[PDB]
Amino acid sequence: SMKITVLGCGALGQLWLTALCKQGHEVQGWLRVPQPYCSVNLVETDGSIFNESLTANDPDFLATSDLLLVTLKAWQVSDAVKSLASTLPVTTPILLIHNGMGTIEELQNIQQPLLMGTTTHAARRDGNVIIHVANGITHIGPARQQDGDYSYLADILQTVLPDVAWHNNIRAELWRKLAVNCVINPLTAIWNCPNGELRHHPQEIMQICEEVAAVIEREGHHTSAEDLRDYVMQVIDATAENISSMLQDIRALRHTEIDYINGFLLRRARAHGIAVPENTRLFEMVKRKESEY
Ligand SMILES: NC(=O)c1ccc[n+]([C@@H]2O[C@H](COP(=O)([O-])OP(=O)(O)OC[C@H]3O[C@@H](n4cnc5c(N)ncnc54)[C@H](OP(=O)(O)O)[C@@H]3O)[C@@H](O)[C@H]2O)c1
Ligand SMILES: CC(C)(CO)[C@@H](O)C(=O)[O-]
Predict the structure, then answer these.
(1) Of 3, 22, 73, 177, which is the active-site residue?
(2) Is-catalytic flag, 289?
(3) Which residue, judged by its Cα, is nearest atom 9 of ligand 2?
(4) Do residues 166 and 140 make contact, with C-beta atoms less than 8 angstroms apart?
(5) Same domain for 70 and 212?
(6) Between helices 202-218 and 277-291, what is the axis angle to 10°?
(7) What is the whole-number distance in angstroms between the Cα of residue 62 and the centre of ligand 2?
(8) Which ligand is nearest the CA of 126, by number?
(9) Residues 129 and 213 in one domain
(10) Which of 6, 79, 104, 194 has the most CB atoms in a 10 Å sphere around its CB?
(11) Which of 117, 134, 168 is the last residue in one of the domains?
(12) Which of 124, 144, 168 is the endpoint of a domain?
């Protein structure tokens, strides 16, 4: 029924391409370097394997797509989206799913309906396959004031890769994800540790949460440092044995998403005159680790 272009055919993109294929939707990948085909290779939670070769980089397929689904790293997002937006119909919604925040600020002139999403699914590259590590929920809603009700997408996507929840205002959700990510990613990348080690660092966590709560406050959302801290510990307790995405990036010598996590927090703090010494130091530490490669 649906025709979807997936931009960013990595771990997340392949997860969605597989799911969308199993429900009989028409899909293609959009790759950085144009190629004969997009190969999709996915090991599901049980152990089953999906192997397909799909259309890639077809501009006509793009011009007649019902949705652009974007599953790029946050620093890759807005240049890639801008370059596809003049071919995609002015009416086709663009759904951004990434960690961090700050991309919407880079996409103010997009004429398409723009949607933002967070997900707790986990998918990992293991050599040449993607492994679906965990199931989860994807929260989606409008990116901007002008973007309307595309809740119909949530219904459709619930039948593809549950669970999916639509929110008329997604901001609170982005901030709560940003808060946990400001804690776990830089600290794990710095200490080279599994998430669960952070349970030994309650003072540092709480210091970061106080800074985040102060900014979220000024951005017009009711929270407290204690509430954010409680949520960080839930996430830590749930993921105790995991290697965070930022630590995985570090270990693998890839560029990190720091500019859209703590980096974005710093941008919002500075815009309001909120001193965030601890987030600043974590940001500098991650940037430094990256300069060693
Ligand atoms: N994986 C997960 O379990 C998970 C869970 C929750 C949230 N997320 C978030 O989702 C986002 C995507 O994560 P991921 O883990 O799926 O990353 P990923 O595996 O690196 O996938 C991104 C893909 O996009 C490709 N790409 C880079 N620039 C492109 C461009 N300009 N045009 C088309 N393709 C391009 C990359 O190829 P190259 O690497 O060759 O450049 C890569 O295959 C991140 O913000 C991440 O934090 C991931
Ligand atoms: C919450 C989180 C930090 C758990 O590892 C995840 O967003 C990640 O790894 O990026």
Answers:
(1) 177
(2) no
(3) 244
(4) yes
(5) no
(6) 110
(7) 31
(8) 1
(9) no
(10) 6
(11) 168
(12) 168
Nearest by Cα to 68 from 32, 34, 114: 114
Cα(217) to centroid of ligand 1, in Å? 31
Q: How far is the CA of 145 from the centre of ligand 1 (A)?
A: 27
Annotated binding residue 185: yes
The reply to whether 11 and 25 lie within a common domain is yes
C-alpha R_g of the chain: 19
Q: What is the CATH number of the domain that holds 181?
A: 1.10.1040.10
Ligand 1 atom index nearest CA of 130: 19
154 is in an annotated binding site: no
Question: In angstroms, what is the resolution?
Answer: 2.3
Residues within a 6 A CB radius of ligand 2:
99, 180-181, 184-185, 195, 235, 239, 242, 244-245
Q: What is the rounded distance in angstroms from the CA atom of residue 207 to the CA atom of residue 234?
A: 17
**CA pair distance 185, 178, nearest whole angstrom:** 10
CA 231 vs CA 48, 175, 180, 223: distances in Å: 33, 12, 7, 11
Phi, psi (rounded to 5 degrees) for 225:
-60, -40
273: Cα separation from own chain's centroid: 27
225-238 vs 171-191: helix crossing angle, rounded to 10: 60
Cis peptide, bond prior to residue 163, ω within 30 of zero: yes
Domain enclosing residue 214, as ranges: 169-291
Residue with tokens 């909120």: 274
Task: Name the phi and psi angles at 138, rounded to 5.
Answer: -120, 120
Count of domains in the chain? 2
Q: Is 8 left (phi over 0), alpha (psi -120 to 50) or beta?
A: left
Query: What is the Å distance from ligand 1's center to 233 Cα?
Result: 26
Cα dihedral 273/167/123/108 (nearest 10)? -50
In the chain, the DSSP E strands lie at 3-7, 26-30, 38-43, 49-54, 67-70, 94-97, 114-119, 122-126, 129-134, 138-142, 164-166
